[PDB]
């Protein structure tokens, strides 16, 4: 429920040592959190928004050129000049042209020639700034229980339902607690400051399309910039990039509009992340978040309930997800009131000996006395199995078989952790929970190593990485000492591996 087949879901089993589980939320996935008690909650990140903006530089593209003045001087009568140069809207260059009797005036030789063109702009990027305040992350809390086929649909009363809650955290007021009536109240101490290393990222608007770029990228662009003064002749600095002054072989000098560079900037943006606008809110759809998580105040709401009488019927074909659970949707006719769901995962008709790990802890119907619909999510064992309900004559039993074995799931979790280290490394170690001198020291060593890695390997494209990785993997078989070859081979393997995990 809000984490169903999203294919980037990560569920953590157990929070042991003080009901304190830290989690790395991101927009690309979701996290299912479960324990021995305290029912299974799906925690997400949905919309990173930024409210107020600050205008850093503006870059023109489509320049319109007129009035094109020009003035020449006899070869020793000084530098060229024209009144239009005092206007500072106009672009000026001074070339040396010939001059003779057949040119006009002079002795003979080479004299200066300036040509000047009006510069006016039509398309420009606004180039707004992001500061690490001013933002709100929206987190959707979703509890597995009395809910059926949800995941979006009717969110205003679904927020009013006890199964869901929206949590708008912000660095003004982090560390928020959401009420889930009957389930308890879930607390969370998120760190919105250290999310994506903002204030290095500028928000960037072309026409209706919007990116997040680096400031070390955005300063270095050779286009005419504006600045921040929002006054008349926006005085475009540069204005020399977007024009080009081309003369003849010796004589007359003409100006050249270099034309709309909008698609060239699109091809230069190969590496930014998209975003959107809502009025003034820059909605970012990417990004992650570290968050401690207080599962202190959770009740199960259904400990002191009865077990439902009969008419179990499940309706929609139990539906295996990506690796995940079996998600069975059931329907209870003939029930009396808020009674529990008996459900389990048994190998056969031998003591029914349940070996499942159902993840929907304590499933509960509402009342309806009628067709009420539940979701159930069960891990089955990797051999043959039966999803079993245990209560009733011809209760309802369904057969099940998996795909893959335990070591396959071990390798699959290994490559999930590999992608967890590839994106967002230096906080992948805070996806798992409580660490004393193991996870904290691993995070610290990965912090030093990743800081040195980012410091000496920045400006690393995909193909750059592959080249340098193959070069260092060749040097790993080279000269001597078994140590510097091992450092070189390990570093080249890290480079090739971080190249593969991004694109694949």
């Amino acid at each position: 429920i809000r984490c169903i087949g999203v294919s980037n879901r990560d569920f953590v089993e157990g929070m042991s040592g003080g009901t304190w589980v830290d989690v790395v939320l991101e927009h690309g996935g979701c996290v299912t959190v479960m324990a021995q008690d305290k029912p299974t909650v799906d925690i997400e990140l949905v919309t990173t928004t930024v409210s107020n903006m600050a205008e850093v530089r503006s870059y023109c593209y489509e320049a319109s050129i007129s009035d094109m003045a020009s003035d020449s001087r006899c070869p020793t009568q000084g530098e060229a000049y024209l009144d239009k140069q005092s206007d500072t809207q106009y672009v000026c260059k001074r070339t040396l042209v010939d001059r003779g009797w057949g040119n006009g005036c002079g002795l003979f030789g080479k004299g200066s020639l300036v040509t000047c063109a009006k510069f006016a702009c039509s398309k420009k990027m606004t180039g707004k700034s992001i500061q690490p305040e001013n933002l709100e992350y929206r987190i959707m809390l979703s509890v597995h229980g009395s809910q059926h086929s949800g995941m979006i649909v009717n969110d205003t009363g679904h927020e009013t339902d006890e199964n869901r809650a929206k949590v708008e955290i912000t660095p003004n007021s982090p560390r928020a607690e959401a009420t889930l009536g009957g389930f308890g109240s879930l607390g969370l101490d998120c760190e919105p400051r250290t999310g994506l290393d903002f204030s290095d990222l500028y928000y960037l608007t072309m026409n209706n399309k919007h990116w997040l770029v680096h400031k070390e990228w955005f300063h270095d662009i050779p286009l005419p910039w504006h600045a921040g003064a929002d006054t008349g002749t926006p005085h475009w600095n540069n204005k020399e990039a977007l024009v080009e002054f081309k003369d003849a072989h010796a004589k007359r000098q003409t100006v050249v509009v270099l034309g709309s560079q909008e698609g060239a900037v699109h091809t230069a943006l190969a590496g930014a992340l998209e975003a959107e606008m809502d009025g003034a809110k820059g909605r970012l759809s990417s990004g992650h978040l570290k968050c401690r998580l207080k599962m202190d105040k959770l009740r199960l709401k259904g400990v002191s309930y009865s077990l439902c009488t009969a008419a179990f019927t499940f309706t929609k074909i139990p539906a295996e997800t990506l690796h995940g659970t079996v998600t069975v949707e059931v329907q209870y006719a003939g029930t009396d009131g808020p009674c529990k769901v008996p459900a389990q995962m048994a190998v056969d008709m031998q003591t029914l000996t349940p070996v499942g790990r159902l993840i929907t802890a304590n499933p509960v119907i509402t009342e309806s006395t009628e067709n009420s619909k539940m979701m159930l999510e069960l891990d089955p064992p990797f051999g043959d199995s039966y999803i079993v309900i245990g209560v009733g004559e011809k209760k309802i039993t369904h057969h099940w078989h998996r795909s893959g074995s335990t070591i396959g799931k071990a390798f699959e979790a290994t490559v999930r952790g590999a992608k967890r280290m590839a994106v967002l490394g230096d906080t992948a170690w805070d996806f798992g929970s409580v660490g004393g001198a193991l996870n904290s020291l691993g995070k610290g060593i990965h912090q030093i190593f990743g800081a040195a890695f980012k410091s000496l390997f920045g400006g690393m494209s995909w193909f750059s990485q592959i080249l340098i990785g193959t070069l260092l993997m060749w040097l790993g078989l080279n000269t001597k000492n078994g140590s510097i070859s091992l450092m070189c081979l390990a570093l080249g393997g890290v480079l090739i591996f971080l190249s593969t995990a991004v694109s694949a």
Partner: antibody
Amino acid sequence: EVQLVQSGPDVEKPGASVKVSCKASGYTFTSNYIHWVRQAPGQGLEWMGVINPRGGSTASAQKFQGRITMTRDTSTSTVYMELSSLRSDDTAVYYCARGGRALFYDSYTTPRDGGSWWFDPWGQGSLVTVSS
Amino acid sequence: DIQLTQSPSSLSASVGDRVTFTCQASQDIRKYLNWYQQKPGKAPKLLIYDASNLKTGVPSRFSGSGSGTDFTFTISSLQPEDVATYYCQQFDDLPITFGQGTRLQIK
């Protein structure tokens, strides 16, 4: 007392430029941003722009960039707004009032406001009529 | 450039009435709104800074409130010297927008 006093009404031709003065009294002249606000007779208020009397920096609205220029005079404690490229839409009444937390320059958005955000100083206003 | 709608357009009431004005911005201006009354062609009378605060010298019959984007101005007792045109003003992001206005008439 704390008061901004403006020049008299002006009648200008279309395509010309008008200049409206705004002289201060009763407070330190380099401590309060002077905001210029227009008002058409058949319309409400509309913010033209802002000058800092310290350092003479300007900013203004999108409907007037390139058309408005704001200068200062620290000696006579006066603020000049020159509106160029006049049209028949510019026949209005022009206002100029403070707004504090005017320590360095520009605007000062997220720091504090209010207490004559720009309410008090306004005085008599300046009717500007653009016709032939 | 935040659009600041002021409701209603104009009103009329007798002396001693309570009246309320609504200003709604299209975006979040959380407490950055203030309120003017302007007598026609004159130096005005002061109502509200920071959407909830009176200034010294203002009579206490005026009040303002509002938290998210909706803001309510309130005159407790209308008086014959309170006929004016009533404006509300955004503070945020600086294309500083005023409301259209609210006129009153003495019954």
